[PDB]
Every structure is written in structure tokens, then in C-alpha cells.
Design a protein around this ligand. Structure first.
Ligand SMILES: [Ca+2]
Ligand SMILES: [Ca+2]
Ligand SMILES: [Ca+2]
Ligand SMILES: [Ca+2]
Ligand SMILES: [Ca+2]
Length: 303
């Protein structure tokens, strides 16, 4: 019963030992029911859940929980807003969000973004990022474009063109269109087919290795992330989590958005994490994160 879940939330907030109940609730019920629960929460208590969570929680666990108890499309918009409004740009955030949402989800947030902010999502991103850097071109094309099915003939053409691109040092002028067309506009099915055609034709060489060769820095992250997401969203989740853990400390902001955006659907993340990085996800978590925050991240990713 919704009114009882409300009680469970209140108690998880008011007892130090019950904090992980917030994560259990988030993972155990569908989004529509969480949204409905929150409406009952305010009806009963007189305060919005968001404000309530803020009064009782702190630091990384607060930031994470606030993200989980939002409709996901609203979360995507807030992240994009947060990354662009005012001085500078959170480029990592934009890449993470834009490149890991399905085409229909992009259309949904274009519409929502305008309702929330009276701004065009595409315009906001282009204004902030420009259209010069390859990561910028990529996210612009995804922000304003569509992923459309194409004929096998087109895949065969593109195979030769991407190989050519991979073979030349640096992104050449005539290569820009190739990288953007494939990574911004291929459907998952077509991308998966090209991925297979490439390794078959080129003695087991991979598109992902070609991306590594061609790009550096944020460009390389962006194209690997688009690669992995098209190949399998669970791969992309593991890659983004690994990157967030990399180096001294870790990027809790990135861990939080990747986990809130993807835990629900990307159940194979832990499998891919171990397969690719050779260490169990929970073991990396153990050495990176502490306390209730670490326990939260491990539990959300547990299928
Ligand atoms: Ca607080
Ligand atoms: Ca800005
Ligand atoms: Ca090249
Ligand atoms: Ca490189
Ligand atoms: Ca680290």
C-alpha cells in the first residue's frame, strides 16, 4: 500500500540504520508508482519528498537518492540544464546523457526541455558546446537528429569509408561526415551489423580500436561511449562507471547520473564490467566507495 511505503520512506530518513530502504524502494517498484508514491507523500506530510530527503540525508547518498526519486525524463532535462545554464559547460555530463538515451527518449526530452525551460534543447547544447570539436559535432547531431534504418548497400559503402578514416592519422575534412553519420545516425541494429562486417572484412580488427586510434581526450570518450551504447547499453554503463572510478578518488557526480539513468534497464552492467576490466564491479566499489553510499551503488547495480 502506497501509504505504507510513504511510512517506510519517512522511517528510512529518520533512522541511520534504515537508509538503504530508500534504495530498496527505488529498485523494487516501477517509476509510475514511485511518482504516485511521492504525490501521496506530499498529501500526507505536507512537504515534498525532495525537500524531506534534503533535510535528512547528506553528501553523495543525498545526491544519488534525489536523482532516483525523479521521473527519468525530468532527470535528463535537469542534468542538461545543470550542465549548460550560466558560466561554462559540464561537457562530460552532456556527453554521458545525450549519447546513452534511445532515439525516442531524445524526442521526449526535446519536448519536456522546452516546457521546463522555454529553451530548445538543441539550441542550448549548440550554444554551449559549439560545433567544432568532434565530441560536440557528435552530441549536436544526436540532440537534433534521428537514428533511421538504412539499406545494406549503405553499410557496405560506410565500411570502406570508416576503414579509410581509421587508416589516416587525425580526423580529415572528408572523414568528419563518416564518423558523424555512423555514430550519430545509425540504428542499433545497423551499427551492430557494421561492427560485425568490419571485424570480418579486416582480419578481426575492431571499430572500437579504430575509435581509439583516431580520437583523443573527450572525443575518444564520446565515440567509445556512442560505440558501446549502440553495441549494448550494459557495455556503455560499465565503461562509464569504470571511467568515473579512474584515477585518484572518483567522480561521484558521474557515478550518480550513470547509476540513476541506467540501473533499471542495464542489468548486465556487472557482467560486462568484469568481462572488460577483469575485476568484479563490487570489488572495485569496495576500494573506491565507502559506507552507505558504496552499498547504495552496489545494490542499485545488482540485477
Ligand atoms: Ca542535506
Ligand atoms: Ca554555459
Ligand atoms: Ca583519420
Ligand atoms: Ca586515442
Ligand atoms: Ca579511483
Amino acid at each position: 500500500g502506497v501509504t505504507a511505503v510513504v511510512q517506510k520512506v519517512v522511517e528510512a530518513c529518520q533512522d541511520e540504520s534504515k537508509r538503504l530502504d530508500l534504495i530498496e524502494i527505488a529498485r523494487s517498484y516501477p517509476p509510475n508508482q514511485l511518482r504516485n508514491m511521492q504525490r501521496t507523500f506530499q498529501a500526507i506530510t505536507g512537504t515534498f519528498l525532495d525537500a524531506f530527503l534534503k533535510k535528512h540525508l547528506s553528501k553523495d547518498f543525498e545526491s544519488l537518492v534525489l536523482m532516483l526519486y525523479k521521473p527519468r525524463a525530468q532527470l535528463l532535462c535537469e542534468l542538461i540544464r545543470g550542465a549548460t545554464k550560466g558560466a561554462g559547460t559540464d561537457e562530460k555530463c552532456l556527453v554521458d546523457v545525450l549519447l546513452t538515451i534511445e532515439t525516442h527518449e531524445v524526442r521526449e526530452i526535446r519536448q519536456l526541455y522546452y516546457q521546463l525551460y522555454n529553451d530548445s534543447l538543441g539550441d542550448v547544447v549548440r550554444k554551449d558546446c559549439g560545433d567544432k570539436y568532434m565530441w560536440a559535432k557528435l552530441i549536436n547531431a544526436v540532440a537534433t537528429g534521428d537514428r533511421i534504418p538504412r539499406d545494406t548497400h549503405e553499410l557496405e559503402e560506410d565500411l570502406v569509408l570508416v576503414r579509410k578514416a581509421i587508416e589516416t592519422k587525425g580526423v580529415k575534412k572528408d572523414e568528419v561526415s563518416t564518423w558523424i553519420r555512423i555514430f550519430a545516425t545509425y540504428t542499433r541494429a545497423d551499427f551492430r551489423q557494421l561492427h560485425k562486417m568490419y571485424s570480418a572484412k579486416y582480419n578481426g580488427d575492431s571499430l572500437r580500436a579504430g575509435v581509439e586510434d583516431e580520437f583523443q581526450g573527450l572525443d575518444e570518450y564520446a565515440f567509445k561511449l556512442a560505440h558501446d551504447f549502440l553495441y549494448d547499453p550494459c557495455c556503455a554503463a560499465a565503461f562509464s562507471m569504470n571511467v568515473a572510478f579512474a584515477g585518484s578518488g572518483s567522480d561521484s557526480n558521474r557515478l550518480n547520473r550513470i547509476t540513476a539513468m541506467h540501473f533499471r534497464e542495464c542489468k548486465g552492467c556487472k557482467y560486462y564490467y568484469k568481462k572488460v576490466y577483469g575485476q568484479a564491479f563490487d570489488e572495485r566499489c569496495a576500494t573506491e566507495l565507502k559506507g552507505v553510499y558504496g552499498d547504495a551503488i552496489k545494490l542499485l547495480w545488482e540485477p
